[PDB]
Design a protein around this ligand. Structure first.
Ligand SMILES: *[C@H](CC(=O)O)[C@H](C)[C@@H](O)/C=C/C(=C\[C@H](C)C/C=C/C(C)=C/[C@@H](C)C(=O)[C@@H](C)[C@H](O)[C@@H](C)C/C(C)=C/C(=O)O)CC
Ligand SMILES: Nc1nc2c(ncn2[C@@H]2O[C@H](COP(=O)(O)OP(=O)(O)NP(=O)(O)O)[C@@H](O)[C@H]2O)c(=O)[nH]1
Ligand SMILES: [Cl-]
Ligand SMILES: [Cl-]
Ligand SMILES: [Cl-]
Ligand SMILES: [Mg+2]
Ligand SMILES: [Mg+2]
Lengths: 1012, 196, 131
């Protein structure tokens, strides 16, 4: 179409057409906008497009066209600058400088084309980064000179200097070599005195202008790095904390400056400086109280109103106060004349903490933690803050977020329902609130109790009754468990429980009942110390939880199950012994009535129940009694099992569900009982493995008869669930087994027989990744005892799994992850298994390792790099033997080059540290002469040539071909540095980072690699 | 009638998936790298009327970056995305922010930590503080589970319209008026293990 | 002396016959795959003037409509090969996205019971719409 004309460089650039294409892109829509976008990207990316830039800047009537021209230049400057003839460098500098001057001198343009001017300033800064000061020594003096001649120019110069400071000090780490960053930082440091002079003069002579704001914006950047004397030995702090706080247009940036000042590197013995630090804070707080709002102001209301920039201001005030006080409050704590200031600042923080804004609350809460942790330890301090802490107790208690355990919530219809999902983003918030409240309770246990008990009184009397209020209170009460003495806790918990019970009587209906029940469950689950001392109470609590397991309210029901196991995890000993005046241990009573108790629960809830019983049973350390308890617990699933094994020996969807649930029940109990589960495993083991085979046959048959789509059917998914749960059971037991001889002698051979050939001989879509996971635990735990078993495992899963995962990075994601975990552990525990592989298979192993570190998936990538490192170590440990010598001849340069590839391709930045570690190991093998044979071919290089010399030659050639824009000297210098630094990982990594910078541009300085 | 929104962040953080979820309801599992930018109108109904975002979903991969900051010109709001399972993506947030605010000096910006559905979270909640000094709103999100998926747009709509009490409301529901079916029946529904 | 005191969904004319949480998919014929359209409450709504029953479904949080169509007597619920808690059916005129458009839908529920209850209610609605 018409628009594509600009892509034809054989003809002159039609600027009118360019402007039309640009307008269509920015202001158009649909297909036309999309077409325009593509054209503009192709235009921008044309390597001669920069030659059109001056023409565009001169003749265009579209500010966006000119922006795009500047982007084209920016790309040239940052990547190919040193490729240009010198006259082209001079020319580009001149027309950028001239354009900036020209735009600043025309008031209308200056006022209305800020985007373009800012883009021009940044482009100038890119040129400075290449040229300054070595080929532009007078830039700063001339900038300073030009500032006096025009307010527009002066203002814009402040933007240039701000951007320069950012690029040199804030963003250089990733974008420049260590040497070049140092050069530019030194260069700015050397001329800062004159920059500051200008800055300060401007600040003295102005009050509220755009110039003043631009100047303060630059100052904010400078404070990241300048020496403190510029801040403390001038009158600048007075100006910042008084004058610039008065005007709202300067207040925002000034407060940010003062926040950074509060972070300057500052002498600690200097009384004078301490005075100045107190004074600026004093000034600032005064200005806030007189110009903005008194300390009594309702900041919650102000924030919620969201007028103008109020939210940002209050955010910034929070940041200022918390930053200053965390560092400096000690300066205000001893002098009685500074007490009012200290408390006023904290009172503003209290007010800020009432604001409804989660992320802001986290910021203030972080400060409160800093404070209360200090008051907990530092002698004679807490009394100073007793009024502040008392108020803070109220704020926290009233703003407690719902604990992860509380599974009921109010919906938009005003109904108390089970939550749809976990509130994952409040887990940390709760922890943080609990932490502060715990400290606050310790600081004054009497105040905290009084606040809570009286708040509770106003719930029952009705005056403050609401779900919100009973909730936050109950959550707070639970959250302080451990802070009181047992005796105080005793009385306190008693009072709380009675009140909650009373509340339940008075507030009827399923919504009220669910809320109060959720709150009682939370509190009782939080106080196991109490439960352990009050058996009658504990027993009755558990029986009530059992009642809730029949609740039609699913939230209450589910919470009862979780509360039951939470209590059992801490109180299990009291269920296993025969309590005074009881006829039997409570576990006996529990097991007997299990069918009734769990009748209304969902299967996963039944499994949780059984898991809790397992915790109790494992308390019995006498073997005969424990085994009998286990047998009793497993009565229902064992009876169901026995009848299904009988019938199977003679598989509809209902039976498959029954089977899955039997095995899941065993997994649950095995999880809590671990080593103690063995006798139950022994009851089902051989028939279970027979069922695995039967199920495997059914799955295979179904796939054969219906096609691969069979694997998506409910029937087949159910059959695979049986296989997966069997594997999980065995994995779970073996991960916890204490008798490894029985594992090897009884469990392993039947397991391998049942699972390995089945995995190998199924089509890819029917193979369970869980087989690999089970095998990883087998190798991890007993691999050292079963060398032939490990070989069998490799033979059955290695090549067939590799073939599933080596066509792309996406297919069979679970197989991919489990496959490399398995290889990792085999390489760690049973290296001999790899030694036994035929050469072609060992080659595939090397291939598989390198394939892993080309993944962007972290699970796989990390394990791949680790396998490689462990492999090298394994080879090295073998010493001077044929296998190791052949390994190096075959694979050393493959590992070196593959590691370089992922280091340098910009698509594997997450792996840098482990990549660098591997490269360093490989290089150090040669420079330590740990490789006995020559790495080179017989006639490739002169005989007797060292591996060191040949390594450098190989690497130089590799890099010369892979990165042809680099000079020979750049490559030589890099390799010299890298090889010398192969015992010093920190320095070695810096040299790699420097190389990664240099390859992105032309003409990088080879002396950069000498950086110390 | 409408607001220009630029969405920026590292490649693979879930920018395009997040927008698609909002446009059509779908969850795209495949990673197809955005090339330069893709523009989509997106409308929400609120108690203060319809609000239209023109969403400029930009490329995060350097090799597909296109006009880069050229896309930010005259943006009225923004979303900066990262992936809580990839620390490098959070590390790069200041870079995206820097490039954005250089062009867009005073706009409301939401920082989003995506993929919180993934069990093995790498960027710890406690670590996420970059937004504080920069006055960005922050949310944990998941385009996959829809965890907080509406929050970024709700916050932005409130800031842009200048009404803290703005809420999404239900659209009016107007009265409503071959063996490609066989293919549909025999193509399995995705994610059969999910709760819904 | 009396002191002077200080100074549309379109669903108002409809009875909720049935409500259930559901996930809705639409079949992309070209790329042969199912795509999610929304998760939320699926309601059967009977117009009190015309006695006509429709499916109206809205997405959680945004409240955007993902299904709006008459429960036609000629529609038939069919199973999906992968699911025991879903139905698939052809719809010739859904107006969720504006203009009337034909779709092959699939709708999945929290359980088989929910799916079965839905089918029963669906067929009840068809009989109502027949009258
Ligand atoms: C509704 C109340 C209602 O309608 O009556 C609520 C939601 C209930 O359904 C839920 C109750 C729950 C737990 C209760 C706390 C369990 C009750 C235990 C109880 C009454 C135990 C007796 C044996 C006591 O020990 C009593 C007499 C004693 O006074 C207790 C309350 C205080 C103690 C231990 C005093 C002492 O000196 O030791 C939901 C889990
Ligand atoms: N588990 C999970 N995966 C997600 C989520 N959001 C996106 N993804 C996945 O992440 C991958 C990348 O998504 P995409 O939206 O293309 O990322 P992008 O930020 O647009 N990449 P680019 O900047 O290159 O265009 C996809 O495979 C997608 O399915 C999420 O919330 N959870
Ligand atoms: Cl512009
Ligand atoms: Cl105990
Ligand atoms: Cl050279
Ligand atoms: Mg049979
Ligand atoms: Mg994308």
């Amino acid at each position: 179409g018409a628009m594509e004309g600009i892509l034809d460089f054989s003809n002159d650039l039609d600027i009118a057409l360019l402007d039309q294409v640009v307008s269509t892109f920015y202001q158009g829509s649909g297909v036309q906008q999309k077409q325009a976008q593509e054209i503009l990207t192709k235009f921008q990316d044309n390597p001669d497009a920069w030659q059109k830039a001056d023409q565009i800047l001169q003749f265009s009537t579209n500010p966006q066209s000119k922006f795009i021209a500047l982007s084209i230049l920016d790309k040239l400057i940052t990547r190919k600058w040193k490729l240009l003839p010198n006259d082209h460098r001079i020319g580009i500098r001149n027309f950028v400088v001239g354009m900036i001057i020209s735009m600043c001198q025309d008031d209308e343009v200056f006022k209305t084309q800020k985007n373009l001017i800012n883009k021009s300033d940044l482009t100038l800064v890119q040129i400075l980064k290449q040229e300054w000061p070595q080929n532009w020594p007078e830039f700063i003096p001339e900038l300073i000179g030009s500032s006096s001649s025009s307010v527009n120019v002066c203002e814009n110069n402040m933007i240039v200097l701000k951007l320069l400071s950012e690029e040199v000090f804030d963003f250089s780490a990733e974008q420049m070599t260590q040497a070049k960053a140092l050069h530019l930082k030194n260069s700015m440091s050397k001329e800062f005195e004159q920059i500051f002079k200008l800055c300060f003069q401007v600040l003295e002579q102005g009050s509220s202008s755009s110039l003043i704001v631009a100047t303060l914006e630059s100052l904010l950047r400078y404070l990241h790095w300048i020496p403190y004397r510029y801040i403390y030995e001038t009158n600048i702090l007075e100006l910042l904390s008084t004058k610039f706080m008065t005007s709202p247009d300067t207040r925002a940036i000034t407060l940010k400056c003062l926040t950074e000042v509060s972070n300057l590197k500052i002498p600690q013995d200097n009384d004078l400086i301490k005075r100045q630090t107190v004074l600026f804070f004093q000034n600032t707080l005064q200005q806030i109280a007189t110009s903005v709002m008194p300390v009594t102001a309702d900041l919650k209301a102000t924030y919620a109103n969201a007028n103008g920039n109020d939210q940002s201001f209050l955010q910034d005030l929070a940041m200022f106060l918390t930053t200053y006080l965390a560092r400096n409050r000690a300066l205000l704590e001893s002098d009685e004349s500074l007490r009012e200031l200290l408390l006023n600042a904290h009172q503003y923080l209290i007010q800020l903490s009432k604001i409804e804004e989660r992320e802001l609350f986290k910021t203030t809460l972080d400060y409160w933690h800093n404070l209360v942790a200090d008051l907990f330890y530092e002698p004679l301090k807490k009394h100073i803050y007793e009024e502040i802490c008392s108020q803070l107790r109220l704020v926290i208690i009233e703003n407690m977020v719902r604990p992860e355990e509380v599974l009921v919530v109010e919906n938009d219809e005003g109904e108390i329902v089970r939550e749809f999902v976990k509130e994952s983003d409040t887990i940390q918030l709760y922890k943080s609130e609990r932490e502060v409240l715990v400290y606050l309770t310790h600081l004054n246990v009497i105040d905290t109790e009084e606040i809570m008990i009286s708040k509770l009184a106003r719930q029952i009397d009705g005056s403050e009754w609401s779900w919100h209020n009973i909730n936050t209170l109950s959550w707070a009460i639970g959250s302080i468990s451990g802070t009181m003495s047992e005796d105080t806790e005793k009385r306190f918990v008693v009072t709380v429980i009675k009140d909650l019970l009373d509340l339940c009587v008075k507030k009827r209906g399923k919504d009220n009942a669910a809320v109060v029940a959720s709150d009682i469950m939370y509190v009782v689950g939080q106080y196991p110390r109490f439960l352990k001392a009050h058996w009658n109470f504990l027993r009755t609590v558990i029986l009530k939880l059992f009642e809730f397991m029949h609740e039609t309210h699913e939230g209450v029901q589910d919470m009862a199950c979780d509360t039951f196991i939470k209590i059992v995890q801490k109180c299990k000993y009291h269920f296993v012994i025969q309590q005074p005046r009881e006829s039997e241990p409570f576990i006996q009573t529990i097991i007997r009535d299990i069918q009734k108790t769990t009748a209304d629960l969902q299967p996963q809830q039944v499994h949780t129940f059984y898991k809790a019983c397992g915790i109790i049973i494992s308390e019995e350390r006498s073997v005969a009694e424990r085994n009998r308890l286990l047998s009793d617990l497993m009565q229902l699933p064992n009876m169901a099992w026995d009848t299904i094994v009988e019938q199977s020996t003679a598989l509809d969807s209902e039976t498959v569900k029954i089977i899955a649930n039997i095995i899941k029940t065993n997994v649950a109990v095995c999880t809590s009982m671990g080593a103690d589960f063995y006798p139950q495993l022994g009851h089902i083991y051989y028939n279970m493995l027979q069922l695995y085979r039967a199920v495997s046959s059914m799955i295979s048959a179904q796939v054969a008869a219906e096609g691969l789509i069979a694997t998506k059917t409910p029937k087949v998914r159910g059959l695979r669930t049986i296989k997966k749960e069997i594997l999980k059971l065995v994995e779970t037991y073996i991960s916890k087994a204490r008798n490894l001889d029985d594992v090897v002698k009884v469990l392993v051979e039947p397991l391998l027989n049942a699972v390995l050939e089945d995995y190998m001989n199924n089509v890819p879509d029917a193979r369970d990744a869980e087989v690999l996971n089970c095998m990883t635990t087998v190798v991890e735990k007993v691999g050292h005892m079963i060398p032939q078993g490990v070989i069998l495992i490799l033979q059955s899963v290695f090549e067939c799994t590799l073939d599933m995962i080596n066509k792309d990075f996406t297919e069979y994601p679970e197989h991919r992850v489990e496959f490399y975990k398995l290889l990792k552990v085999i390489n760690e525990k049973s290296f001999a298994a790899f030694l036994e592989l035929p050469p072609a298979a060992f080659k595939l192993f090397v291939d598989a390792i390198c394939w892993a570190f080309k993944h962007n998936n972290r699970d796989v990538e990390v394990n791949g790099l680790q396998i490689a490192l462990d492999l090298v170590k394994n080879i090295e440990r073998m010493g001077n033997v044929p296998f190791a010598n052949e390994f190096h001849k075959n694979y050393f340069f493959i590992f070196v080059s593959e590691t370089f590839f992922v280091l340098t391709d910009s698509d594997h930045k997450s792996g840098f540290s482990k990549q660098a570690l591997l490269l360093m190991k490989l290089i150090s093998l040669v420079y330590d002469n740990k490789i006995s044979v020559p790495l080179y071919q017989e006639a490739e290089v002169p005989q007797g040539t060292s591996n060191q010399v040949y390594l450098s030659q190989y690497l130089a050639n590799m890099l010369s071909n892979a990165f042809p824009h680099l000079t020979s000297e750049q490559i030589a210098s890099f390799l010299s540095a890298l090889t010398k630094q192969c015992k010093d990982l920190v320095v070695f990594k810096g040299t790699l980072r420097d190389f990664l910078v240099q390859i992105k541009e032309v003409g990088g300085d080879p002396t950069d690699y000498l950086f110390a | 009638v409408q607001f220009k929104l630029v969405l920026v962040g590292d490649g693979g953080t879930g920018k395009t998936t997040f927008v698609k979820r909002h446009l059509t309801g779908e969850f795209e599992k495949k990673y197809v790298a955005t090339l330069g930018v893709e523009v989509h109108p997106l409308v929400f109904h609120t108690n203060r009327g319809p609000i239209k975002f023109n969403v400029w979903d930009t490329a995060g991969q350097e090799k597909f970056g296109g006009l880069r900051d050229g896309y930010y010109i005259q943006a009225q709001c923004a979303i900066i995305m990262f992936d809580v399972t990839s620390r490098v993506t959070y590390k790069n947030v200041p870079n995206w922010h820097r490039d954005l605010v250089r062009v867009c000096e005073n706009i409301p910006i939401v920082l989003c930590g995506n993929k919180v559905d993934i069990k093995d979270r790498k960027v710890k909640a406690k670590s996420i503080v970059f937004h504080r000094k920069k006055n960005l709103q922050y949310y944990d999100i998941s385009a996959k589970s829809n965890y907080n998926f509406e929050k970024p747009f709700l916050w932005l709509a409130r800031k842009l319209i200048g009404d803290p009490n703005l809420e999404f409301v239900a659209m009016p529901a107007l009265a409503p008026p071959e063996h490609d079916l066989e293919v549909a029946q025999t193509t399995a529904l995705p994610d059969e293990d999910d709760d819904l | 002396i009396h002191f002077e005191p200080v100074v549309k969904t379109m669903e108002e004319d409809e009875e909720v016959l049935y409500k259930v949480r559901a996930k809705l998919f639409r079949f992309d014929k070209d790329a042969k795959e199912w795509k999610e359209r929304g998760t939320g409450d699926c309601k059967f709504l009977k117009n009190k003037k015309t006695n006509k029953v429709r499916i109206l479904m809205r997405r959680d949080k945004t409240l955007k409509i993902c299904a709006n169509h008459i429960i036609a007597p000629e529609y038939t619920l069919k199973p999906n090969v992968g699911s025991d808690r879903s139905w698939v059916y052809a719809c010739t005129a859904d107006i969720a996205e504006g203009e009337a458009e034909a779709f092959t839908f699939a709708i999945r529920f929290g359980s088989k019971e929910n799916a079965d209850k839905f089918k029963e209610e669906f067929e009840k609605a068809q009989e109502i719409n027949k009258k």
